[PDB]
């Protein structure tokens with residue numbers, strides 16, 4: 001039987017790595033893309049379809065599930081896996097991003113964060129409660145409860161925020177370890193903060209490594225800083241993390257962001273872009289994104305992408321999908337989403353294979369030349 | 374190879390019949406239920422899923438497709454079957470119901486009907502244009518262009534409407550026959566009108582039989598008359614139609630309506646109820662409909678129906694589907710719709726098998742006793 005957690009690196013090229021994470025519920029091929037399913041569903045897809053696209057793991061969120069249908073309720077019903085019908089690993093975010101994004105709904109203290117408004121209803125999160133919710137969900141990869149520092153941030157505020165997150169990281173560690181069933185069957189990842197500042201990123205990495213985690217996320221990015229800045233921060237931040245554990249870049253991203261992040265040592269990704277923008281009519285192709293709503297696609301018999309191996313591209317035309325999306329038809333959302341998630345997984349497969357073969361640098365160059373032609 | 378059209382009756386019980394319609398694109402088992410897909414999609418289902426539920430044929434609509442994406446456009450793209458990815462028979466309604474339902478948008482004459490409002494855009498239908506559109510779509514069963522008489526109607530107005538429909542039926546016949554490819558590969562059904570009046574129903578049946586059609590629809594019902602009245606009209610109306618051709622009751626209906634209509638000699642049905650009410654949270658079960666939104670289902674681990682063989686009932690709980698529908702999630706619509714269409718197809722299968730075995734009367738009684746308990 002598989003271990004609780006084992007990350008193995010099979011091949012490297014520069015800072016890029018490819019390998020596997022073995023967990024009780026399955027193997028995760030890295031670099032990995034995690035489709036997002038905040039409401040216990042990857043929007044518009046059956047779990048079998050998510051799996052058919054090549055996904056090894058999906059992401060859920062403590063915050064959303066706490067509100068609906070409720071953490072205790074999901075536990076009573078047998079856990080998140082049984083509830084939604086996905087039997088493979090699930091990573092759950094801790095709510096720490098919502099601490100920032102929904103801050104106007106919040107009262108924050110060193111103890112935790114209380115969210116208000118069911119109208120005006122209150123829900124509390126803290127390192128202890130976040131870890132408890134993730135246990136109730138039966139999460140396989142549990143994220144520490146942090147605060148995603150807003151961007152931009154002054155060095156003083158970035159430091160204060162990061163320092164609180166490191167204290168919360170220790171509390172997350174202790175809460176996780178104190179629950180035997182969780183400690184024995186799930187993994188716990190810490191989240192590096194520090195905004196765009198090298199010294200704070202170093203302090204955060206050191207604090208997290210001292211505590212010790214199964215994996216290390218780079219938090220606090222993909223919050224409006226832009227690719228140049230994000231890459232600049234990754235350049236110094238990723239090498240600060242333990243080399244022998246997975247590196248997870250939260251919230252990234254567009255295909256080119258993913259490629260560049262892998263070039264900088266990232267092993268795991270999540271983003272709503274393929275799902276959300278899919279429902280909005282944006283389809284990813286090897287020649288760049290297209291908006292299927294555009295009148296130029298109304299009689300285009302080609303598939304969304306000329307090479308894509310997904311079921312959507314095997315069967316339906318751009319013209320049909322154009323019609324569906326224009327008409328607001330549910331099947332439009334379904335087909336766009338399946339194709340985009342499949343595209344993302346094919347991207348990850350090409351990345352993995354090219355690293356394994358020592359030709360990732362060439363792949364990255366070729367990918368960019370064509371995607372941005 | 375299969376014929377253009379051959380209806381064979383394999384077994385009978387009272388007025389009920391079971392058999393097959395063989396057409397070039399496939400065999401239709403009767404009594405048959407046709408899922409509705411007005412916008413070139415059965416809402417929230419891939420065609421493969423529609424087929425997996427047991428559907429042999431689906432319904433499209435001349436009116437909706439004329440407006441979006443356009444009949445000529447669909448023809449240019451290779452026809453409706455290729456466009457939407459359903460390779461089996463498709464029946465297309467003629468627009469005659471919309472002549473009534475959208476009458477405030479219309480100017481009507483003996484020549485046809487023009488619909489207004491793309492803002493204020495005009496679109497014309499007539500027997501000739503309706504049949505032409507259905508040809509452009511590549512419909513397998515073409516419906517005559519009629520007018521669904523509003524309900525209630527005075528005998529005078531019902532007569533005038535019916536008489537116009539019979540003139541339009543002859544024009545539909547001639548338009549269909551004048552197009553060699555259509556005449557050789559598709560079938561044409563006439564539509565009986567006459568409101569709730571026996572003498573007008575008889576005149577309409579006689580006119581249609583004199584013209585001659587491949588099948589005969591009972592039109593002008595399921596327009597607010599209620600089951601008692603609908604059944605009363607079917608009691609005298611269905612025997613007026615040629616016995617050796619299919620009898621299609623347009624717009625019906627709830628499960629009990631279908632059972633009673635089969636008891637009265639109906640072979641084919643269409644209705645948006647399982648799809649539309651599915652998206653609205655109504656699930657059909659052998660113990661009657663339930664509304665999955667109801668709080669009583671929030672922690673109910675049972676499938677939607679205890680006996681249903683559909684994929685949804687094999688995998689997901691009422692509690693999960695309750696959550697999805699409450700959350701407005703697309704997967705909620707998908708799962709409810711697949712289950713409801715599967716339920717309807719299982720109903721049709723039970724009807725067919727019971728007629729084949731000479732125990733349909735018993736089935737109808739048992740069905741009603743449990744469904745309305």
Ligand SMILES: CNc1nc2c(CC[C@H]3O[C@@H](OC)[C@H](O)[C@@H]3O)c3nc(N)[nH]c(=O)c3cc2[nH]1
Pocket residue numbers: 036038059060061093094095096097098143146147148149191218219220221222223250251252270271272
């Ligand atoms: C988009 N960029 C981005 N996403 C981020 C997320 C996930 C949001 C999570 O919240 C939901 O999206 C709003 C989804 O479930 C998503 O996985 C983050 N989560 C934590 N705990 N800490 C961060 O510093 C953080 C930074 C992010 N930057």
Ligand SMILES: CNc1nc2c(CC[C@H]3O[C@@H](OC)[C@H](O)[C@@H]3O)c3nc(N)[nH]c(=O)c3cc2[nH]1
Pocket residue numbers: 409411432433434466467468469470471516519520521522564591592593594595596623624625643644645
């Ligand atoms: C609901 N009851 C009912 N439906 C009916 C339809 C189909 C509407 C068609 O229009 C669309 O639904 C509005 C769907 O495509 C549907 O198949 C009818 N069509 C014709 N041509 N003539 C009728 O007398 C008629 C009567 C109906 N009664």
Ligand SMILES: [Cl-]
Pocket residue numbers: 036043272275276
């Ligand atoms: Cl999404």
Ligand SMILES: [Cl-]
Pocket residue numbers: 409416645648649
């Ligand atoms: Cl519908």
Ligand SMILES: [Zn+2]
Pocket residue numbers: 304305308309310311312313314339340342343
């Ligand atoms: Zn594709």
Ligand SMILES: [Zn+2]
Pocket residue numbers: 677678681682683684685686687712713715716
């Ligand atoms: Zn079912």
